[PDB]
From a paper:
Ribosome associated complex (RAC), an obligate heterodimer of HSP40 and HSP70 (Zuo1 and Ssz1 in yeast), is conserved in eukaryotes and functions as co-chaperone for another HSP70 (Ssb1/2 in yeast) to facilitate co-translational folding of nascent polypeptides. Structural analyses indicate that RAC on the nascent-chain-free ribosome is in an autoinhibited conformation, and in the presence of a nascent chain at the peptide tunnel exit (PTE), RAC undergoes large-scale structural remodeling to make Zuo1 J-Domain more accessible to Ssb. Our data also suggest a role of Zuo1 in orienting Ssb-SBD proximal to the PTE for easy capture of the substrate.
The best resolved class C2 enabled us to generate a reliable model for both Zuo1 and Ssz1, based on the crystal structure of CtSsz1-NDZuo1 complex and the AlphaFold2 predicted model of ScSsz145. Except for a disordered region of Zuo1 (residues 50–70) and a highly flexible β-hairpin of Ssz1 (residues 458–488), the cryo-EM map has well resolved densities for all rest parts of Zuo1-NTD and Ssz1. The first involves the first helix of Zuo1 ND (residues 33–44), which is sandwiched between the HPD-containing helix of Zuo1 JD and the IA subdomain of Ssz1 NBD. The second is between the surface of Ssz1 SBD (R521, K534) with the N-terminal sequence of Zuo1 JD (E83, D89), through polar interactions. Very importantly, this conformation of Ssz1 is stabilized by a previously unrecognized interaction of a sequence on the IIB subdomain of Ssz1 NBD with uL24 and the H7-loop of the 25S rRNA. Secondly, in the State C2 of the RNC-RAC complex, Ssz1 undergoes a very large rotation to flip to the opposite side of Zuo1.
Author numbering:
A (entry chain A): 1 to 49, 70 to 282
B (entry chain B): 1 to 457, 490 to 538
The structure:
């Protein structure tokens, strides 16, 4: 690991000829390894098999998500992958199953082989595969709902002219999904009573967020580690969790404190 | 429930059995005599038959009816076989166009045994030792061979195992088989190039393996049928002759039985001095009615064996030049075999190579296992993966259209600050493949250089330009090289914070 040339010419132009197979060589390898038994399996096995469907994405909303890696999947948005970019977190469990059954026949790898598509779409299929078990788990979906920054609507811009109930309108439901407390007080209108305003901001001042950050773990405990290495990762992973918990809580406090003055 | 499947490493000097327990780990099956690496020897005392180190005991007493080193005579006729290798054991004769052996059973009757008969009855109790430990019958096994056995030998091993009822379901090469258990116990943090070293008693095997995303491939292999632990043993045989003839004025070389018991007691010191600093020898009735007592340390042993050990490091050097590599490039040297237990052979390899090569051996604090065992434990790992498969699926997985992956001969990568070449996707890489490099400290505007690379005896020289990409005002970037099944090189450069990504295509 070393430094970069860091040049200011900044060209994005390919200048050479097309990629030939003259630096490509083709002697066989030995049938050994767990990754031999999967690399063969893609060309051996390749196993793959209403009002609610009107809420889905008809076409893939993120076209760049198709080319994204199966290994780099944590930065990938699974709701755009599942076809739930409109609803995201509020989709039901049976809706995820029906969305999974739609996308399995649209991007069938044998049909992708029938349509002449490359194996890069099969890398997007491994996104489609493990999104299902992540979103049917009560914990893992809620962990993915805890990091959904796309659904995180920002507060409106300072210095602009806007209606207070219309611009801060959709804002406070973005954290109301993180409320541990039920019922959810509403913002109301201009004719709201003073007691309802006091019952509003006390709910937001004593707010209870269940948002966790295990999905933001860059280092995960491997099973090949020894006993101290699984402990060493965990204290670092907790250190990421509480820092992002407190900073977002302070952000939520600043979300509380800005709405008082405005 | 299907039949249990076990791994077989069949060797010149030792054979070992591995089996995957219901706890999903490797367990070594031992013999009834308690020794894990069962020796490859058969001795007949009348009608009775002995195997293992028990059969090696009658070699000093009944050498004409004790067989040894019968791996290199299988599948090929006698004229291509060196008879003087088993000149200490039973004579090898001409039987049915292949190699056979003359034995003596009870009452002096002569039976003429084929080498095909030898492997079957050797695997008869390799079957028995495995099924007694596990408690259930075995019918199939994965057999590890050196890569210089051709297909006509593999059918003969398949036929001779079918004489007793063993189905050799797959053949795998020993450098490929031994490395997998090291990779399972100690996975590599990066894709590396490694050398498997199999130093047996009578032959030495070295092969260069590129570890590329879990795919194990041959660059070049080397074999020496004359370099091995026998040369370690025979050097001590003339050594123990030296103090014996000066002290007691007798020649132990001129008697075959005296030389055999000297060869037998010298064979123990190769194992004994691998763990201790000294070893002692007490032989009753060596030659001319004389006993012998002496103690031999490590250092005088290493002073004796420095000629042979230099040849062992020279055998490492030739297989690197055969694949045309530089020992700076190679990442590790993996060791297997009973010779690899010797700590002198460990120390020669950091001296004759750069310090960046980590020698994987018994002395290693971070990645060590048993060199006599590491071949068989990889075979059980391949046995567990294929245990879900019928014969039709695995034979279709064995097809040359599938087992042949195209690779990439000339490596690609990133250009450095001083124009040096930093490879991302290295040499010898199969495709499709995608790798991620996190340039977290990258601040400002960057030009990303994608070039082919040329390697010479080692610094990387910048070669043919592939593409160029640039990022503006970036604060942390990731560089991704993506190659599909069609050989098209696509490069993705993504800003780590803003998400601004520039894509290059070729």
């Amino acid at each position: 690991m070393f430094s970069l040339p860091t040049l200011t010419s900044d060209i994005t132009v390919e200048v050479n000829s097309s990629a030939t197979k003259t630096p490509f060589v083709r002697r066989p390898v030995e049938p050994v390894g767990k990754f031999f038994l999967q690399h063969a399996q893609r060309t051996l096995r390749n196993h793959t098999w209403d009002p609610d469907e009107l809420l889905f994405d008809t076409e893939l909303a993120d076209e760049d998500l198709l080319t994204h890696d199966a290994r780099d999947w944590k930065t990938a948005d699974l709701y755009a992958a599942m076809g739930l970019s409109k609803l995201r977190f509020r989709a039901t469990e049976s809706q995820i199953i029906k969305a999974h059954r739609k996308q399995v026949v649209k991007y069938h790898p044998d049909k992708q082989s029938a349509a002449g598509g490359s194996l890069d779409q099969d890398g997007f299929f491994k996104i489609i595969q493990k999104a299902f078990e992540t979103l049917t788990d009560s914990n893992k979906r809620a962990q993915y709902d805890s990091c959904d920054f796309v659904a995180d609507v920002p507060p409106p811009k300072k210095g602009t002219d806007y209606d207070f109930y219309e611009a801060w309108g959709p804002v406070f439901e973005a954290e109301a999904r993180f409320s541990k407390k039920t019922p959810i007080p509403s913002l109301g209108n201009k004719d709201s009573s003073k007691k309802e305003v006091e019952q509003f901001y006390a709910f937001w001042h004593r707010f209870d967020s269940w948002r966790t950050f295990e999905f933001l773990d860059e280092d995960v405990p491997d099973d090949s580690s020894n006993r101290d290495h699984k402990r060493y990762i965990e204290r670092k992973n907790k250190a990421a969790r509480d820092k992002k918990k407190t900073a977002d809580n302070a952000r939520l406090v600043k979300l509380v404190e800005r709405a008082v003055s405005e | 429930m299907s039949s249990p499947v076990i791994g077989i490493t069949f060797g010149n000097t030792s054979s070992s059995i591995a089996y995957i327990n219901p706890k999903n780990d490797v367990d070594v099956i031992a013999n009834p005599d308690g020794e894990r690496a069962i020796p490859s020897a058969l001795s007949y005392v009348g009608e009775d038959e002995y195997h293992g180190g028990q059969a090696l005991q009658q070699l000093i007493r009944n050498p004409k009816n004790t067989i040894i080193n019968f791996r290199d005579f299988i599948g090929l006729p006698f004229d291509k076989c060196d008879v003087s290798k088993c000149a200490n054991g039973a004579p090898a004769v001409e039987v049915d166009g292949k190699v056979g052996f003359v034995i003596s059973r009870g009452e002096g009757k002569e039976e003429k045994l084929t080498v095909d008969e030898v492997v079957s009855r050797h695997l008869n109790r390799l079957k028995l030792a495995a099924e007694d430990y596990i408690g259930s019958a075995v019918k199939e096994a994965v057999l590890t061979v050196p890569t210089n056995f051709s297909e006509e030998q593999k059918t003969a091993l398949k036929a001779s195992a079918a004489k007793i009822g063993l189905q050799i379901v797959q053949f795998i090469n020993e450098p490929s088989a031994a490395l997998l258990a090291h990779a399972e116990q100690f996975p590599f943090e990066k894709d590396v190039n490694v050398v498997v070293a199999d130093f047996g008693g009578i032959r030495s095997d070295a092969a260069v393996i590129a570890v590329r995303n879990g795919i194990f491939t041959i660059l070049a292999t080397a074999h020496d049928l004359s370099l091995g632990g026998d040369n370690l043993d025979t050097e001590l045989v003339e050594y123990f002759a030296s103090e014996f003839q000066k002290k007691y004025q007798a020649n132990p070389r001129k008697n075959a039985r005296s030389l055999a018991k000297l060869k037998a007691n010298s064979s123990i010191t190769k194992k004994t001095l691998s763990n201790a600093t000294s070893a002692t020898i007490s032989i009753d009735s060596l030659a001319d009615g004389f006993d012998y007592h002496a103690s031999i340390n490590r250092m005088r042993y290493e002073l004796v064996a420095n000629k042979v050990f230099a040849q062992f490091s020279s055998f490492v050097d030739s297989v690197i030049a055969k694949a045309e590599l530089d020992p700076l490039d190679i990442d590790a040297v993996l060791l297997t075999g009973g010779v690899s237990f010797t700590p002198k052979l460990t120390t020669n390899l950091e001296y004759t190579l750069p310090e960046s090569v980590e020698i994987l051996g018994p002395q290693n604090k971070n990645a060590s296992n048993n060199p006599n065992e590491l071949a068989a434990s990889g075979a059980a790992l391949q046995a567990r993966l294929i245990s879900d498969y019928d014969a039709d699926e695995l034979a279709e997985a064995l097809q040359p259209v599938i087992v042949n992956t195209p690779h990439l001969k000339k490596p690609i990568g990133l250009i450095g600050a001083k124009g040096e070449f930093h490879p991302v996707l290295l040499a010898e890489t199969s495709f499709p493949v995608q790798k991620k490099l996190t340039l977290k400290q990258a601040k400002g505007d960057f030009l990303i250089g994608v070039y082919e690379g040329d390697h010479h005896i080692k610094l990387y020289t910048l070669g043919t330009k592939l593409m160029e990409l640039g990022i503006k005002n970036a604060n942390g970037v990731e560089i991704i090289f993506n190659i599909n099944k069609d050989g098209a090189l696509r490069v993705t450069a993504r800003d780590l914070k803003t998400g601004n990504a520039v894509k290059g295509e070729l």
